Amino acid sequence: GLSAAADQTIKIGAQSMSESEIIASMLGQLIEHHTDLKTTTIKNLGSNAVQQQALMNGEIDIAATRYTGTALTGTLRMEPEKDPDKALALTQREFKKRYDLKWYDSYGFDNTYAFTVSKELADQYHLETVSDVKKWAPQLKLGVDNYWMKLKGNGYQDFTKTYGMTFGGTYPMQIGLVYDAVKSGKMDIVLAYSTDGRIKSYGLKMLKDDKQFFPPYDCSPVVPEKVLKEHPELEGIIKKMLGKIDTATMQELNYEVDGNLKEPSVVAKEYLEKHRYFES
Ligand SMILES: C[N+](C)(C)C[C@H](O)CC(=O)O
Questions:
Q1: Rounded CA separation 251/210 (Å)
Q2: In what side-by-side order are the strands of the sheet with 204-206?
Q3: How far, in Å, is the centroid of ligand 1 from the Cα of 111?
Q4: What does each C-alpha distance from 248 to 111, 199, 255 come to in angstroms?
């Protein structure tokens, strides 16, 4: 019954990325700061599609981190849109219309796929753009995440068709491993995620996507309208995180987990404390 709503546990989904665990924990702690609601994190969701299904079948009440470009092509099956603001607006409109899901404004950061090399290699061969490695592709070993080879739309197949290059070797691995793979020289180039905290201190260089192959990937929480109706305090709490977390900050938080060996819940807690829970 409705009088039991206050007694329910809010299930917050996290994908298998440090970023998603940090943000899921932050949102849970913020909810507990303001309400008597219990929260839990449903971790290790594999992908955008897994999160989408889990929202529609009640397995998660909030998806902590979704990315506009991924949802536009993968979930909505729409033509890609190059403009970040337009992509977000389209995604918001269609998510409400098709799924009765609220796709919130962004936290303030985007997390894009980015072809990444050591600064040493970039300096030696004057590498600035993806096209700059076209003539080198057969002599390069590329490390990628464990999903990108089969991924539709902005995956390996469409990349080869759009950029007209294939690498001498492709090596799928868990995303977290690619940073050490390129730093150590095992890979010459990797498809990194732009918010990773290791890119800066590992001395890595992200190449410009000069063909604009990759869409915008602004990050937002997504919540079913039914959940918002049953817990009317959630709207105001989620709003407190929006537009407040920039890409440099997200990278720093990711670094705390991956480079400074902190648990995502501790990273989230320390950030909330530093910023006085977003109201000083
Ligand atoms: C963040 N980004 C866009 C690099 C990868 C996506 O999260 C992949 C996914 O969510 O399925």
A1: 23
A2: 169-172, 141-144, 189-193, 113-118, 204-206
A3: 8
A4: 11, 11, 11
**Crossing angle between the packed helical segments 247-258 and 18-34, to the nearest 10 degrees:** 100
* CA 219 / ligand 1 centre spacing (Å): 10
Sign of CA dihedral 57, 86, 73, 198: negative
* Position 7, amino acid: D
Pocket test for ligand 1, best of 44, 109, 111 (most atoms within 8 A of CB): 111
Nearest CA, atom 1, ligand 1: 111
Unique residue bearing structure tokens 């404004």? 105
Domains assigned to the chain:
1-111+217-280 (3.40.190.10), 112-216 (3.40.190.120)
Cα of 132 vs centre of ligand 1, distance in Å, is 25
Tokens coding 187 = 């890979």
